[PDB]
Design a protein around this ligand. Sequence first.
Ligand code: NAG
Ligand code: NAG
Ligand code: NAG
Ligand code: NAG
Ligand code: NAG
Ligand code: NAG
Ligand code: NAG
Lengths: 222, 212, 239, 203
Amino acid sequence: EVYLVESGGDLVQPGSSLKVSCAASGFTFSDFWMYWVRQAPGKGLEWVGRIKNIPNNYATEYADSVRGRFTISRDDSRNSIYLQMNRLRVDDTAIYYCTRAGRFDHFDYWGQGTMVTVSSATTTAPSVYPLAPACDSTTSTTDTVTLGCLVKGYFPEPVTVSWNSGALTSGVHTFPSVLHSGLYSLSSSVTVPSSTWPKQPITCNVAHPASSTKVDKKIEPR
Amino acid sequence: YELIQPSSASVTVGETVKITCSGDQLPKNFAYWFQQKSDKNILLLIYMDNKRPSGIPERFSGSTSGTTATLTISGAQPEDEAAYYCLSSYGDNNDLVFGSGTQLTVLRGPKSSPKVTVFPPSPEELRTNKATLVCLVNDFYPGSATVTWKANGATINDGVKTTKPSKQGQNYMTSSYLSLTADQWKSHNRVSCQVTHEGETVEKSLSPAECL
Amino acid sequence: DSGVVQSPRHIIKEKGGRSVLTCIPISGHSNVVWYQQTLGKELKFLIQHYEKVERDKGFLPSRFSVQQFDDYHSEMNMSALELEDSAMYFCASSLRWGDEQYFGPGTRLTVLEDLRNVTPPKVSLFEPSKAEIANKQKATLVCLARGFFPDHVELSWWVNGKEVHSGVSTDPQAYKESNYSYSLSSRLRVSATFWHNPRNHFRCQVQFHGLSEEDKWPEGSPKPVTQNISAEAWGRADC
Amino acid sequence: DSVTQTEGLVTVTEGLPVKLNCTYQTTYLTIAFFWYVQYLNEAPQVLLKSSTDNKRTEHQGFHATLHKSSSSFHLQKSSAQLSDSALYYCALSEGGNYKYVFGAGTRLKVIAHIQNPEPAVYQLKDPRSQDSTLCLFTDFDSQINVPKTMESGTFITDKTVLDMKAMDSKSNGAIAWSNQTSFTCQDIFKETNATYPSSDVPC
Ligand SMILES: *[C@@H]1O[C@H](CO)[C@@H](O)[C@H](O)[C@H]1NC(C)=O
Ligand SMILES: *[C@@H]1O[C@H](CO)[C@@H](O)[C@H](O)[C@H]1NC(C)=O
Ligand SMILES: *[C@@H]1O[C@H](CO)[C@@H](O)[C@H](O)[C@H]1NC(C)=O
Ligand SMILES: *[C@@H]1O[C@H](CO)[C@@H](O)[C@H](O)[C@H]1NC(C)=O
Ligand SMILES: *[C@H]1O[C@H](CO)[C@@H](O)[C@H](O)[C@H]1NC(C)=O
Ligand SMILES: *[C@H]1O[C@H](CO)[C@@H](O)[C@H](O)[C@H]1NC(C)=O
Ligand SMILES: *[C@H]1O[C@H](CO)[C@@H](O)[C@H](O)[C@H]1NC(C)=O
């Protein structure tokens, strides 16, 4: 029941300032040093810093990558530590993770994280476009049929793409995003038996947490 | 300083693998091995370079000689194919540092073949005067297949973008895109997406872009 | 040297650990023997060596293998240490066969299950009692080092920068406050006149012994290394 | 072969005599017998050694004459100082095997003698941490049996003697502490034969 919840991430323009927090629950936040750690999309884990408790003068230590701009702060009264980040750089865009180190426990619990996007761009609402074949390219083994949706035009944090509001879970295929001209894009496939969709609804429910993307696209035939 | 870790790794189900992390100050500072799955969850496998936490597979040993600690996955399993990061300290202030992580892959054996699926630009898509051709490829193992598009039998090298993900327990995939001027596709003739699956000179061609 | 030398005098390690003891015999003496004193003091014969590594074996554990050198330096190799090996390893020396042996300072090593259990103590200086001063005309300063593990401590009293023993009384052996927590108290008594003197300093120093070079300490907190923790107070409390 | 000696603790009051019994058992011609004194926190040092069958082998207080006939190297000391408080080892070296036999050992605890016992238990404080249930039992007779802890968080050490700057008599001590900040020295010090002097602070 030990819980670590990061909060504060956000997309902000370079040279900016972001202060993310790390919450705690399920133990004596008291006898533990806490640390900060970010990770770039395809990049590995990168340690940011650590902050000891009071008996250790709350000593703070930061990696070289952010020694002069990044800072950590602890708030025992709330059982939390924060990260004040200034003069931010795109290369700072990452998901920050906070862990803990006790007398016997070491880096066991990690929080979900919190996304920070440092870029000179703005939330570019996504656009979903139905994907459908049926161009009987003579050599049809159409044992099944596939299709999906082309979410394109979004850039913020990850998004969501369901099908028939969950009902359809088997035969789905949400691939990894793609960086295109500063704008993300992503498609989602689904494979059913030939005689199942032109009759049954094959709708895809796209979402984009950034900007209320309550989208639904009832994929009709051509 | 810097911690070395092999860029990747490969072990066959049942067998055993060995990930090495070389650290100049290893002899002085402890090591810690973490596991990161496609899900992006951080998992502490071993700590104090050789003491595994309860709840973790006993096949995860963690020795460490001189300046090189090692994670050892005995009888490697499928659900074990993920990222592995060694952790340690350095300097007087025991600064912390991770390795360049390692990407071990678990070989199964069932060699499947490609399953391409091209998709012509959407009507509304063309509406915006844009032609983004999505060519997918499913159910295949193992080697990555370079999905190269072609125009009338002549490769295409502009506005394209592909990946090589792998999920669906024992099932690899890809999403080789391809943008195009609405007045390029409308005025195109043979949009292709040649896939090249490992092991074979594979060429699922599926020469698309013909009807209307 | 005309005196046996032993090193190190304190070794804390975890199981499986591997340490080595050393002994510099009295110059001239050829006969060198290693002894082990276990819980309560029962000198037990390990392995004896005479003029180089010629030997008369004993209960010396196969894991431990000692050899002599040219200078006659003899070391004791400890490997695969176990909680049972926790002892006081003395090294004695002597001349020709049969006359007066000489024990070195000894190396007290403690093998533990969990190093993380090691921890410095907490020194607290408790001032005298107004009563005592009035009635008995004396001032008794009580010192109480608490919550520390390897009872590898040595309390010392320091008045005015100078170490003192007259009137000092430290506990013989540290008590086991808990299963993983020891404690040791001591007391010092000085005249009610000396106590009252505000220009008089009193310091209780507790020399604790922890890990060293081979500091393989968990990266989650401060390594408890050998250290000196103290507590000091001056003269009469101002009224 | 063996060198057996008293197994008790031999508690003694300063001034009275002492006598640790040591007998040996050897198959070879003994070369020399010795007595070792190992003081608290110190390596074992020779106290005295002998080879003749009658030489009141003397040293910094102790004396012990050997007697082959009855096989014995008994040790005794008329007046006993508190400094004598230590562990004693009887040993020897015999021919043939070259063996250097050692005695089991004998602990020695000489206690003090208080002229005018003034039993009293005070409660001292600690300017540092606010918590501090400390008690000091002093000047109580050297023969009284200091009570023992009856509950956790509490603790009563063992009596200990202190002889301040050579001026006069010494003093027996015994301190106690607890977490049960509800208790008082009188309670903590169960079975009490003392005065628990204390009151409000002037000024
Ligand atoms: C101690 O003995 C062990 C035998 O297990 C050996 O590996 C080691 O090198 C020896 N080291 C020393 C200092 O004697
Ligand atoms: C270490 O000490 C702590 C506190 O005394 C105790 O809880 C623990 O059981 C000991 N051993 C280990 C392996 O934690
Ligand atoms: C610690 O206490 C436990 C009781 O749970 C006991 O079994 C064990 O022997 C003790 N260990 C130490 C090192 O005191
Ligand atoms: C600890 O003891 C050493 C040697 O006795 C002494 O030099 C040093 O000053 C002591 N440390 C403190 C803090 O008193
Ligand atoms: C020998 O006699 C003395 C004299 O009382 C006694 O103290 C000692 O205990 C005896 N030896 C043994 C082994 O009891
Ligand atoms: C106080 O006594 C000990 C040590 O002070 C502590 O562990 C315990 O929790 C307290 N007493 C009780 C009854 O809990
Ligand atoms: C009780 O016992 C003692 C031992 O000190 C004796 O001196 C005295 O008569 C009694 N004193 C008190 C305070 O009971």
